[PDB]
Amino acid sequence: MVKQIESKTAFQEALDAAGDKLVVVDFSATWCGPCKMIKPFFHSLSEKYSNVIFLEVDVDDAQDVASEAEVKATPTFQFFKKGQKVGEFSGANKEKLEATINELV
């Protein structure tokens, strides 16, 4: 499914429960409108790819984790694995997520 990150504490334990499988992340903005209409797409992958771990960070409630990756352009997606960043990109191209997932699949 998905997991809402409230701070960096849950972010670390999240990568711990992931183990070694892929772990994508979704940095959106609730206070924002357009950067919010793209959540039914990312969260939809949760049930389409039960073999992948999807997270959900809020640059307003979890601004602590957003400052780590320095996200200055939402929405943004990051590819983490074994707790190591291996890929990432920013852009409201929800369709790109498909070709991207087949990148580090």
Curated annotation (Swiss-Prot):
Residue numbers carrying S-nitrosocysteine: 62, 69, 73
Stated consequence of mutating residue 72 to A: Strongly reduced interaction with CASP3
SUPFAM superfamilies, per database record: Thioredoxin-like
Entry protein name: Thioredoxin
GO BP of this protein: cell redox homeostasis; cellular detoxification of hydrogen peroxide; negative regulation of protein export from nucleus; negative regulation of transcription by RNA polymerase II; positive regulation of DNA binding; positive regulation of peptidyl-cysteine S-nitrosylation; positive regulation of phosphatidylinositol 3-kinase/protein kinase B signal transduction; response to nitric oxide
Family: Belongs to the thioredoxin family.
GO MF annotations in UniProt: protein homodimerization activity; protein-disulfide reductase [NAD(P)H] activity; protein-disulfide reductase activity; RNA binding; thioredoxin-disulfide reductase (NADPH) activity
Localization per Swiss-Prot or TrEMBL: Nucleus; Cytoplasm; Secreted
Oligomer status and interactors: Homodimer; disulfide-linked. Interacts with TXNIP through the redox-active site. Interacts with MAP3K5 and CASP3. In case of infection, interacts with S.typhimurium protein slrP. Interacts with APEX1; the interaction stimulates the FOS/JUN AP-1 DNA-binding activity in a redox-dependent manner.
